[PDB]
Amino acid sequence: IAALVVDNGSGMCKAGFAGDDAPRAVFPSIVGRPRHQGVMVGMGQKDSYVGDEAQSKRGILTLKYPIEHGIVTNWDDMEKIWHHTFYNELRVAPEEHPVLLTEAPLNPKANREKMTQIMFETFNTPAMYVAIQAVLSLYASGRTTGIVMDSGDGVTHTVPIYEGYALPHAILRLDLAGRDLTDYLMKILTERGYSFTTTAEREIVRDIKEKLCYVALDFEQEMATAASSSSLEKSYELPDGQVITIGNERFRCPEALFQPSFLGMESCGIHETTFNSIMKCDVDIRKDLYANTVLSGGTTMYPGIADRMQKEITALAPSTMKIKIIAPPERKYSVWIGGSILASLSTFQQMWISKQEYDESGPSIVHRKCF
């Protein structure tokens, strides 16, 4: 039987069977409910739409993300996401196949506990493992020594991993993520009088970000150009047909990854957290990391972010280093791909916790393997 691989991303759920080269199910991790009383009873409405359903019916629903910064905040909402993942999106009985769960680094013990409990007892999975997302990210490029800079909708994190072993004390988390950049995008679009408030409107702003924002290579000269010619500014049209112009705002939004001060976060920028994790690594190995900075997760998709990460972390490194930013295509779903790779293998076939083990030993098996 083929194990099931699920990337529990904060914004989108990527899932499939082991050995697929790309995820089968790729959908926004949304649970919806209706904002108004239902009146055409002959329609036969259902009380909570999920995934692409909620995104289809958008403006009659309140939209809930159950995962905030990797923390599962609402469990019955997340349980419905997994129910839909299994019975509808993949069409499989999860009690008959082993399951691979991705998880974010430095995420509290209880999240793994409740994930475990729900898998082993709501879905009765037969065997299971929970992988540190960055491991899978590095593995996805086929390399086995580097530092990963992961940056999803909910978490940005830096993990050094050498000869395939992680450095746990040298990990960093920064919660400034894709949602936060959507937040700041609202605020700056408000300057040109484009207000967006409802969750539905939030999704419009997410769409806008995903197609007109880009990482400026040279912020000062760019912003001087933006104050000198309209040629850097362009437009997009709403689901309401009307056009909206995105301008200075284009670059100002993604600039925040390097300047978290712009969202009033004192926390260091992504170039600083990568550097500050390399400098937490043992003095020997820093070279091996500089040739192997791998980017992963969807907010690493901004045009020019690689160029900026390079030209920035260049300044943080000493001169005479091969500072090479590994930013391929498929970085989008890389984490999942790595899951599928690792899942296919007899060595990893030792790692999966048997349901029976958990059943007999309680949470005491997972309380170890979470490190």
Partner 1 sequence: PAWXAXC
Ligand X SMILES: Nc1ncnc2c1ncn2[C@@H]1O[C@H](COP(=O)(O)OP(=O)(O)O)[C@@H](O)[C@H]1O
Selection from a second copy, Mg ion, partner 1, none that 152 binds (CB < 5 to 8 A by kind) is Mg ion
Those residues with Cβ within 8 angstroms of residue 292's Cβ, 6 or more apart along the chain or in another chain: 143, 145, 146, 147, 324, 326
Question: Of 178, 297, 338, 339, which one interacts with Mg ion (CB under 5 A)?
Answer: 297
Selection from Mg ion, a second copy, ligand X, none that 223 binds (CB < 5 to 8 A by kind) is none
Nearest approach, Cβ of 252 to ligand X (angstroms)? 14
Nearest approach, Cβ of 95 to a second copy (angstroms)? 27
Segment interacting with a second copy (CB under 8 A) among 16-24, 80-88, 264-272, 293-301 = 264-272
Q: How far is CA 67 from CA 48, 53, 116, 168, in A?
A: 17, 18, 16, 24
The packing angle between helices 270-278 and 305-316, to 10°, is 50
Identity of the amino acid at 165: Y
Segment interacting with a second copy (CB under 8 A) among 13-21, 155-163, 297-305, 327-335 = 155-163
Nearest to 307, CA basis, from 321, 323, 283, 319: 323
Helix, strand and coil in the chain, % to nearest 5? 45, 20, 35
Question: Of 187, 276, 301, 316, which one interacts with a second copy (CB under 8 A)?
Answer: 187
Q: Is 211 buried (19+), middle (13-18) or exposed (0-12) by CB count in 10 A?
A: exposed
Site for a second copy in 75-104 (CB under 8 A): none
| Helix (H) or strand (E) segment spanning residue 293 | strand 293-296
35: its two tokens: 């904002």
Question: Of 209, 252, 308, 355, which one interacts with ligand X (CB under 6 A)?
Answer: 209
**Which CB sits closer to a second copy, 1 or 40?**
40
- Alpha-carbon span 121 to 124, nearest angstrom: 5
**Which CB sits closer to partner 1, 127 or 204?**
204
- Alpha-carbon span 204 to 216, nearest angstrom: 23
Selection from a second copy, Mg ion, partner 1, none that 217 binds (CB < 5 to 8 A by kind) is none
Question: Of 64, 206, 252, 308, which one interacts with ligand X (CB under 6 A)?
Answer: 206
Could you tell me if 179 and 263 are in contact, meaning their C-beta atoms sit under 8 angstroms apart?
no
Size of the site for ligand X (CB under 6 A): 18
Site for ligand X in 279-308 (CB under 6 A): 297-299, 301-302
Question: Of 64, 112, 308, 332, which one interacts with ligand X (CB under 6 A)?
Answer: 332
Question: Of 4, 9, 194, 295, which one interacts with Mg ion (CB under 5 A)?
Answer: 9
Selection from a second copy, ligand X, partner 1, none that 128 binds (CB < 5 to 8 A by kind) is none
- Alpha-carbon span 238 to 240, nearest angstrom: 5
H-type alpha helices, 219-294: 219-226, 248-252, 270-278, 286-290
Question: Of 32, 98, 105, 154, which one interacts with ligand X (CB under 6 A)?
Answer: 154
Q: ∠ CA(227), CA(233), CA(236), 5° rounding?
A: 150
11: its two tokens: 């914004």
Contact code string over 46-75 relative to a second copy, x by CB under 8 A: -----------xxxx-x--------x----
Selection from Mg ion, a second copy, partner 1, none that 263 binds (CB < 5 to 8 A by kind) is a second copy
**Which CB sits closer to ligand X, 82 or 162?**
82
Report the interface residues with ligand X, using CB under 6 A.
7, 9-12, 152-154, 178, 206, 209-210, 297-299, 301-302, 332
